Amino acid sequence: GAMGSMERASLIQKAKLAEQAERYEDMAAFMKGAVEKGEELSCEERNLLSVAYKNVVGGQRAAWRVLSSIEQKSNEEGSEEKGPEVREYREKVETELQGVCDTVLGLLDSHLIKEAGDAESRVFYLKMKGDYYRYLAEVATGDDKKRIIDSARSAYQEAMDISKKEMPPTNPIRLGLALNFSVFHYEIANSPEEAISLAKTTFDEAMADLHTLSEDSYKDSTLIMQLLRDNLTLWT
């Protein structure tokens, strides 16, 4: 590891600086270095890790979608099949995306998840595992597409089972997990009814628990609840 000689605390501090500078590839490399020190991560640290890689892979996904759209248009009957360049460059971006996903999944498997005993850490990491298999599923076309989809589903399902036993319905990790698992159902699993049912049940159960929250927790929970409603408005 290129970060192996840097102090854990220095890596975390530089991740925070990279975030302020909108240098998310650096942020992710710093947080990968911090994870590789082998100690469990605090709440703030888990969110630094997640924010870094979600921004990196988010940029790759956006680029891949542009390139895939160009590629599909270049293959419609009535175009001008220039040559291999669009496919080649889409594949390059795709391979880089798959490499980032594999890196994150490797950090979760070695060894974040197995050491995560508290619900807030374990559910957070299993949600991430579902998310990064979902990103792999978005680009998958070959013999392992069903298996990638089921790996996402299985991770999300374990996270949901823990969250329903261990967290209140307004817990923002529980809400964000359900938001993303609902998107998995709609966009990946071709299960729009399951996606709508999950988002609606999650929203209604959170609504009925809002009265227990402080003003600050209320703001956190209702933010994700609005995203659930936004998706339901898109889908219905």
Binding site: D131, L179, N180, V183, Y186, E187, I224, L227, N231, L234
Partner: peptide, 5 residues
């Protein structure tokens, strides 16, 4: 595209 976090 749908919202995720």
């Amino acid at each position: 595209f749908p919202a995720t976090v």
